[PDB]
Subunit: 642 residues, 2 copies
């Protein structure tokens, strides 16, 4: 039969569970023993009457571990009136709360990503309480915090594990670790707690792109900055951890290739440097996005707008260009001597590629005062005449143009230029004097030389070649061209005929000088050729009438001394000295007749000597004054009559 | 001086810009000419009046490209009254919209991660309009969508570039591509359009862990399921692309080594198989988290709660254990023959480790009807006595216990057991006969043997060895211990004295037989020794009185034959035959007297011849029957007066 008692674990040995003999009204005898003791039993039985007392130590957690019931079963045998009996006894061992919740370790380290969704579960080491029932772990508490809570769950074989659950989204940059106190406690007003620490390690996600310390940057860069010049040390920052926050600098992928060759970005430090050479006169502003990138699985990027303003340097000098209105030779401007005052000759351009004062030009002209500088428009100055030009006075000019910029120091450019004045037919031939006077002795040879005329045209080339022409004029009906000829190149006048003074005294040539111009220019002069007389006409006796060189006149013997017989008149063709007639009645032996040398009047020296019938011959000559003189003779006879 | 006109690009050649002679009130002359004719000039001037017309085509976009202003400069020279003059002229060339916005290429390919925050800018190929001012690129057109909204920004050098900007979070699993044709038109009333293709390709991020078609699953596993048995084909899914969505199955990191050695998960297919062996009697429920993992750089994981409930099979047979109250040998129970009805002898345990009917046991006992089975508690049956036991009748019993479980089919276990009955001193010695009788011849030697007695004790060991003792009783005053002795071991009786029948006829010995037990048991018997006579008593003659064998008697002579003279009496000490008196009348010569052998009376044969004075001599003897017979002698004389 089954008799049942109840004990309480870890009681002092020798406590009264019960007594069989008395509990079951057992009158008779008893030799109460346990039937077998393979291990040293925990309960002792009084042989006298079957009293069951706590023998050794009774630890429920050692004999039943986590089993909800713990019954110690023993078989006692007795003897009553020579009958051996058996009684089966079951002693329920009640549980005492002599064990407290325990955790494996004082700290539980756990890891979770900041990118995990709310509700993600994180395992925790289970607590254990070696008691059973209410004396086992009933409740769990977590320390007050914002993010984490616990939930307890039981497995199908009854093992009661715990989970840490995430309530709010994490951010490792705000908070990267958590320290939470975890505790478990059992039932019954005598309550026992056990504790541990949860160390939550928040693992980083790359949820932050880099960002530059400054969103945009401008830097100034001299256009003569040397290679390696440091423009700027770019800086960025990333809050993420380790590689996710480690930055590498460079260009935005859209930056053209010119910039990538001109400028360089150190990928580690962000230094931005010049590797090429810039030129303000070509491009004065660069605009590009630099970028920063973190070294993460899914990299994040940020950009910074960089502006480089290039600054101008005086690296250009003035350029002088000269373009003439009219010219043939290089670097020579031509202009007609006919150009009026303030005529444009050539245009000067003075330019400077730079900007500001460095590109501003002052132009100055050096040369004869006949030319002036006149500004036409920006950096464009005209050369203009200030006075009338005269090729015959000045045929060319050498000029000098200087152009300086306003840099400090300034660049100076110098250039030379030549002006040549074009000929117009501005001057006509000019005879030394308008009227020339020359003389020619009568009875010349034919083809004799009289004179030469000269006219002058100072114009050059064909416009200044003189041509001489005999103007056609009449001379005693006939034309001038028959008496005289003129070499049209030299202007030499040659006589074609032999001239006779007795006929023609003066010959008036009219010569024209012409240039080889278009229109032709002419001028006239006159040569007054003088023919002067000579002694080629001997005088002739007119009265008395001549008969083969002889004559006769009679004389009355009735007449006085110094008689008026006859009057010898004579004529000469020449002029002046050569027409000075002097008379002589001479060589007669006896002095018979006497002559008046003035008016050729012949008188008698002797008295009336004979009566009648006398013949007397003498000679009477007429001469002129010129050298050599010529003369003619008349032989006249006189007779005495009554 | 600078005189200013204005024209419009690509106008009809020969069109009138203006007239210098008339515009500048130029009275006088003019032989208007250009100074520069080294390249083929695009403007020609009429000599008469200085009016210049468009010679060739004038294309602003080719002489000034993208330059805001386009002024052609020309230097003309005239001659007025022999004076050469110069006039500088600036002809503004105005732009018309004979050029349309355009994009460098027919397609713009673009890639963006679905994980990019709002506001991320994607650069786009810049548009170009070769006109200037309002005729330049003024407007950018965007396609209506929820995620991409673009923004136009202007640079230091005035070009209007456009950025593709994202305002709302993308999801490549929701939407993975976009195709947007990008075009722009310029300002001013006649607008010209130009276009390209934008192909937005969304790149995948590993933003979705795998998840199982079922969060938990339970499977039943027979405890005799063979190695390789298929428990379950795990299935999991991942929306992500390529390797980010390709799964490998295995155990959660917390799974003990017992489970990892016992069960196996194929990483590729997720098949869960038994490689070891389970035993319901050892562990009947397994619980573990299987997990699936995507093959991504930093993979994402999911778990599935797997329950394996083990099923019981009848793989254990009942075990029989027997524990006796009292025992010496292995597998042998002892019990005293003194036990009463229904005394506990031994406890049988019949158990089966299985569960259900497979573990439920029926116990049956086979053997002598003196023992039966009585259940004490669960799987615990008592062997009990049913009747009184007697070691002397049955000392040992061979029993058999049978224990079957209730499986289908059932397991049966048999066991043998032996019970031995312990001896108690329940029996006392008992003699063959209660009263023994033997005889002894008189006059025996001293120290002679009479008989031997034997008693019987069936009890065992000391409880059955008999010792005999002579009970102290008196015989004619003295104690019996003096006539006889008893050997306590053999039971032999030796005669101590020599016995005389005349005195002692019957000797009543009282023997006790006792066993060697505690308490000691005794029983008594009696030996009646009878003493029988012998002939060691010679008889003597009493009447008449004797004198060394002689006597004398007188008688008167007056009588005939047969007279009463004298009467010869004798006595014998023995009994029976040896006390048989025989009378003899011995020789006297003459036939004088004759004797009656019955009553010892002697008479006379001859008459009275003599009166007085005669002496007569004879002998008369008495004898007994025994062998040898004994006799004494007496001589009697008779005389007359
Ligand atoms: C204007 O300038 C011309 C150009 O000549 C010069 O060339 C350079 C070397 C520099 O000196 C410049 O400053 C200058 O422009 C002058 O022409 C030169 O004239 C001289 C003298 O008349 C010539 O030399 C002569 O040669 C002949 C024959 O060999 C000799 O008989 C003379 O005795 C004399 O040495 C020279 O050839 C000529 N140069 C050229 C290139 O033609 C010119 O004098 C000047 N005009 C004025 C008005 O100043
Ligand atoms: C109770 O059991 C004992 C011993 O246990 C027995 O051992 C074997 C026989 C097993 O097969 C078991 O089945 C069995 O329980 C029995 O004792 C045996 O008795 C036999 C009786 O014939 C003996 O054999 C005889 O022995 C004599 C003298 O030695 C010979 O002259 C005969 O020719 C014959 O062989 C045997 O020796 C004996 N053995 C032992 C170990 O004791 C016993 O019989 C049994 N009791 C009952 C009532 O069945
Ligand atoms: C166990 O102990 C804790 C303190 O460690 C208590 O707060 C709890 O209520 C239980 O008694
Ligand atoms: C659990 O354990 C902690 C530290 O071990 C204690 O501070 C707490 O009161 C509880 O007993
Ligand atoms: C080209 O087309 C666009 C619209 O498609 C207009 O903005 C433009 O004016 C031109 O017609
Ligand atoms: C610009 O060009 C596209 C083709 O690339 C046209 O489809 C569009 O209408 C616009 O004219
Ligand atoms: Ca305890
Ligand atoms: Ca406890
Ligand atoms: Ca507890
Ligand atoms: Ca963060
Ligand atoms: Ca982060
Ligand atoms: Ca980052
Ligand atoms: Ca430069
Ligand atoms: Ca410069
Ligand atoms: Ca300069
Ligand atoms: Ca002149
Ligand atoms: Ca001239
Ligand atoms: Ca001239
Ligand atoms: Ca002459
Ligand atoms: Ca003359
Ligand atoms: Ca003369
Ligand atoms: Ca155009
Ligand atoms: Ca245009
Ligand atoms: Ca346009
Ligand atoms: Ca997605
Ligand atoms: Ca995805
Ligand atoms: Ca995935
Ligand atoms: Ca099993
Ligand atoms: Ca089983
Ligand atoms: Ca079974
Ligand atoms: Ca008995
Ligand atoms: Ca006995
Ligand atoms: Ca006995
Ligand atoms: Ca005797
Ligand atoms: Ca006798
Ligand atoms: Ca006798
Ligand atoms: Cl003459
Ligand atoms: Cl005797
Ligand atoms: Na830096
Ligand atoms: Na599968």
């Amino acid at each position: 039969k089954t008799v049942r008692y109840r004990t309480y674990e870890e009681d002092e040995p020798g406590t009264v569970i019960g007594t069989l003999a008395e509990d079951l009204h057992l009158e008779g005898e008893g030799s109460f023993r346990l039937m077998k003791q393979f291990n040293n039993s925990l309960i002792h039985v009084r042989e006298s009457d079957g009293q069951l007392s706590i023998g050794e130590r009774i630890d429920r957690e050692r004999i039943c571990r986590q089993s909800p019931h713990c019954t110690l079963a023993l078989d006692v045998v007795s003897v009553a009136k020579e009958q051996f009996k058996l009684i089966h006894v079951e002693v329920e061992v009640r549980d005492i709360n002599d064990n407290s919740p325990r955790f494996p370790g004082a700290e539980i380290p756990v890891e979770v990503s900041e990118s995990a969704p709310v509700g993600t579960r994180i395992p925790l080491d289970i607590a254990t309480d070696e008691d059973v029932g209410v004396n086992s772990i009933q409740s769990f508490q977590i320390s007050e915090n914002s993010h984490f809570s616990i939930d307890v769950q039981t497995r199908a074989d009854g093992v009661k594990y715990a989970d840490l659950v995430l309530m709010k989204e994490l951010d490792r940059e705000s908070q990267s670790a958590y320290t939470l106190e975890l505790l478990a406690m059992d039932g019954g007003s005598p309550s026992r707690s056990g504790t541990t620490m949860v160390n939550v390690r928040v693992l980083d996600f790359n949820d932050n792109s880099p960002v530059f310390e400054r969103s945009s940057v401008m830097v100034e860069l001299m256009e003569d900055a040397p290679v390696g010049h440091l423009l700027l040390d770019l800086d960025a920052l990333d809050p993420d951890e380790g590689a996710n926050g480690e930055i590498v600098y460079g260009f935005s992928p859209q930056v053209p290739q010119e910039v990538r060759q001109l400028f360089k970005i150190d990928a580690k430090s962000g230094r931005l440097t010049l590797e090429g050479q810039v030129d303000f006169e070509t491009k004065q502003t660069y605009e590009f996005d630099a970028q920063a990138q973190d070294m993460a699985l899914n990299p994040l990027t940020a950009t910074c707008k960089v502006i480089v303003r290039v600054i101008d340097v005086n690296d250009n000098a003035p350029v002088i260009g000269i373009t003439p209105l009219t010219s043939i030779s290089a670097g020579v401007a031509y202009i007609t001597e006919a150009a009026a005052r303030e005529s444009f000759v050539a245009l000067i351009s003075t330019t400077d590629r730079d900007s500001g004062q460095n590109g501003q030009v002052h132009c100055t002209l050096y040369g004869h005062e006949h030319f002036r500088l006149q500004q036409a428009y920006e950096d464009s100055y005209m050369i203009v005449t200030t006075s009338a030009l005269d090729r015959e006075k000045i045929a060319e000019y050498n000029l000098t143009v200087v152009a300086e910029d306003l840099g400090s120091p300034p660049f100076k450019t110098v250039k030379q230029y030549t002006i040549r004045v074009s000929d117009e037919n501005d001057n006509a031939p000019v005879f030394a004097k308008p009227v020339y006077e020359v003389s020619v002795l009568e009875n010349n040879a034919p083809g004799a030389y009289i004179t030469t005329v000269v006219a002058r045209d100072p114009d050059f080339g064909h416009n200044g070649k003189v041509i001489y022409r005999l103007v056609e004029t009449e001379v005693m009906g006939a034309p001038i061209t028959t008496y005289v000829s003129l070499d049209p190149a030299t202007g030499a006048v040659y006589a074609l005929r032999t001239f006779n003074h007795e006929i023609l005294q003066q010959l008036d040539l009219r010569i024209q000088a012409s240039d080889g111009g278009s229109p032709q220019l002419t001028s006239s002069a006159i040569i007054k050729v003088k023919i002067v007389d000579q002694n080629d006409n001997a005088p002739v006796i007119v009265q008395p009438a001549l008969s083969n060189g002889s004559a006769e006149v009679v004389v009355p013997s009735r007449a006085p001394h110094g008689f008026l017989v006859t009057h010898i008149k004579a004529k000469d063709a020449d002029e002046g000295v050569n027409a000075e007639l002097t008379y002589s009645i001479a060589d007669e032996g006896r002095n018979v007749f006497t002559i008046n040398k003035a008016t050729g009047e012949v008188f008698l020296v002797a008295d009336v000597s004979e009566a009648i019938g006398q013949v007397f011959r003498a000679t009477v000559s007429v001469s002129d004054s010129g050298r050599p003189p010529l003369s003619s003779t008349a032989t006249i006879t006189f007779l005495v009559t009554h």
